């Protein structure tokens, strides 16, 4: 499946992809690099635009 990831942060904002065949297989390797920096960011499925939107 085709899907990406936009973060929106006031210091730290990216634009990235992701390419997995469901949701949980991306995220595995989301929580993993949730821990790498340690952040308190808050994600939200945007079905709308098959889009992610990353909240801190």
């Given at each position: 499946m085709?899907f990406k990831?936009?973060?929106?942060?006031?210091?730290l904002?990216?634009?990235?992809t992701?390419?997995?065949?469901d949701?949980?297989?991306?995220?595995?390797?989301?929580?993993?690099?949730?821990?790498d920096?340690?952040?308190?960011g808050?994600?939200?499925?945007?079905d709308?635009?098959?889009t992610?939107?990353v909240?801190?």
């Amino acid at each position: 499946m085709t899907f990406k990831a936009i973060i929106n942060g006031k210091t730290l904002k990216g634009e990235t992809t992701t390419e997995a065949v469901d949701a949980a297989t991306a995220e595995k390797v989301f929580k993993q690099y949730f821990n790498d920096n340690g952040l308190d960011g808050e994600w939200t499925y945007d079905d709308a635009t098959k889009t992610f939107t990353v909240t801190e």
